[PDB]
Design a protein around this ligand. Structure first.
Ligand SMILES: CCc1ccc(S(N)(=O)=O)cc1
Ligand SMILES: CCc1ccc(S(N)(=O)=O)cc1
Ligand SMILES: [Zn+2]
Length: 257
């Protein structure tokens, strides 16, 4: 199956997932000079006060913090979005070194990592139906740079030892994802896709301009995770990012002047 190695990585994905060469693939480079302020964008609303985290899972590609999405507990609305999008999970992509790891780039700059908060459009009833729609998902993307520690990330960092290998999970209740946000909600937005197989073109991307800072020690612990299962030869979970894809017939809009 697919992965991030030389023999199963992004250059190979198109053979089983032909949409990999599609018209609205993600991630993309964000050319800041070409992006245009869009006065039609409504204020962005991140409403995570009632978020109910459940579990953290190493899925062999990254780790997911999963949420109870059986009700409108944690939602994203406004901005480019019509209606209500419910938080289902977050995860990260990161590098083997601080100079790489993000999926989106900004004027070709790579960040050390990128956080994806994944939401589905409630008008479609469930996540599975949402990923059959052109406006099924909204992903809030946040860049990570290495500097001062992010206090709201430490609980995640500290549980990673318990989910080292593929298929391991742990209880992860009472985690507040608000602690992962930067101060500013200024963003860029464009229509795109999932950045891993099946690469479905269902996503409205909302990428925050302001990165969060995490410490070297925090990201080093991400890099101790394993792609492999227990008892198998160790393959460090690093460089689990897809590079930028052709922009094609798209415009990136900015929320800020
Ligand atoms: C838990 C982190 C956090 C940080 C700031 C806020 S707020 N927007 O100031 O109420 C809430 C929660
Ligand atoms: C279907 C699972 C899934 C959910 C989110 C992503 S991503 N990396 O946020 O585009 C990829 C895959
Ligand atoms: Zn992702």
């Amino acid at each position: 199956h697919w992965g991030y190695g030389k023999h199963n990585g992004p250059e190979h994905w198109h053979k089983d997932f032909p949409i990999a060469k599609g018209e609205r693939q993600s991630p993309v480079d964000i050319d800041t000079h070409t992006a245009k302020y869009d006065p039609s964008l409504k204020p962005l609303s991140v409403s995570y006060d009632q978020a109910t985290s459940l579990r953290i899972l190493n899925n062999g590609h990254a780790f997911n913090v999963e949420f109870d999405d059986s009700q409108d507990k944690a939602v994203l609305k406004g901005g480019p979005l019509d209606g209500t999008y419910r938080l289902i999970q977050f995860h990260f992509h990161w590098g083997s070194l601080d100079g790489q790891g993000s999926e989106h780039t900004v004027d070709k700059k790579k960040y050390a990592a990128e956080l994806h908060l994944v939401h589905w459009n409630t008008k479609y009833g469930d996540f599975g139906k949402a990923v059959q729609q052109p406006d099924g998902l909204a992903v809030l993307g946040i860049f990570l740079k290495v500097g001062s520690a992010k206090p709201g990330l430490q609980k995640v960092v500290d549980v990673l030892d318990s989910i080292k290998t593929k298929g391991k999970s742990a209880d992860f209740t009472n985690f507040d994802p608000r602690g992962l946000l930067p101060e500013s909600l200024d963003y860029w937005t464009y229509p795109g896709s999932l950045t891993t197989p099946p690469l479905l073109e269902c996503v409205t991307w909302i990428v925050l301009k302001e990165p969060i800072s995490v410490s070297s020690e925090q990201v080093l612990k991400f890099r101790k995770l394993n792609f492999n299962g227990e008892g198998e030869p160790e393959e460090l979970m690093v460089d689990n990012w897809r590079p930028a894809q052709p922009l094609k017939n798209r415009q990136i809009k900015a929320s800020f002047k």
